[PDB]
């Protein structure tokens, strides 16, 4: 139902501060699922969403071993990556990860994903296909060869389909009550003038994904693109100025998933 998402991993090399810290977070749509931190008081992974607490210790004890495993493969991988570039161990670097699947309205497998990151942006990402990788460095090739040897892509593809997806639908049916809501955003219309010679926003919506089109004219200068923002509860929130007598022909068009009609 145009609703499916991802798992996030973060590992930070500390400024000679011992061992990296590791953050395992998960998500279904814009609704987060699991919370692991290595300097947390709990060496288990915590559920912050209530509808994953319908899962038993069979699911928790079997997912707290795996995240520790991820922390270890991270804590070793950074030692490798910084070990084979040009760094000093007093240095502090960062590694962020990605793997996962999306699904269409028939809840059937939409294409899945899997990407890595060094200090910079893109390091290695699973391409929009099955067996392949996208690398653009030099070390990237040696490690992607290392994944061409281990036959990683297909053994991860067997998880992207049939393990991420049925668990995704399982989550969509065990939290069906909290994902029935396509919360429509409510609008007003305000004005403020400073010189003698406005605002396009949305306030309460469940998927963050909203286009806010601001007559037959295109723009390049006037609007300041702002990022979509969390309202701290599972809702999200999201200007242009013109001569004081000519702010009266334009309208703001909005398309949202919970909006059957684009708004004038």
């Amino acid at each position: 139902g145009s609703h499916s998402m991802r798992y996030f991993f973060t590992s930070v090399s500390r400024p000679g501060r011992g061992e990296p810290r590791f953050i395992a977070v998960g998500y279904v749509d814009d609704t987060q699922f699991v919370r692991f931190d290595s300097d947390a008081a709990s060496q288990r992974m915590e559920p912050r969403a209530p509808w994953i607490e319908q899962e038993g210790p069979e699911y928790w004890d079997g997912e707290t071993r795996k995240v520790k495993a991820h922390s270890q493969t991270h804590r070793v991988d950074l030692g490798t990556l910084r070990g084979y570039y040009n760094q000093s161990e007093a240095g502090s670097h960062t590694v962020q990860r990605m793997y996962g699947c999306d699904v269409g309205s028939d809840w059937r497998f939409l294409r899945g994903y899997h990407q890595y990151a060094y200090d910079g942006k893109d390091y290695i990402a699973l391409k929009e296909d099955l067996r392949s990788w996208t690398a653009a460095d030099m070390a990237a090739q040696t490690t992607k060869h290392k994944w061409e040897a281990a036959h990683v892509a297909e053994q991860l593809r067997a998880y992207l389909e049939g393990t991420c997806v049925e668990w995704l639908r399982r989550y969509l049916e065990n939290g069906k009550e909290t994902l029935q809501r396509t919360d429509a955003p409510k609008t007003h219309m305000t004005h403020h003038a400073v010189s003698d010679h406005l605002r396009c926003w949305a306030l309460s919506f469940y998927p963050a994904e909203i286009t806010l089109t601001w007559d037959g004219e295109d723009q390049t200068q006037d609007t300041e693109l702002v990022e979509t923002r969390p309202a701290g509860d599972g809702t999200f929130q999201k200007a242009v100025v013109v001569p004081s007598g000519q702010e009266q022909r334009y309208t703001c068009h909005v398309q949202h998933e919970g909006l059957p009609k684009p708004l004038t």
Binding site: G26, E63, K66, A69, T73, D77, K146, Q155, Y159, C164
Partner: peptide, 9 residues
């Protein structure tokens, strides 16, 4: 739910 084989770079 989680990916179960130890991936290393």
């Amino acid at each position: 739910l989680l990916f179960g084989y130890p991936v290393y770079v």
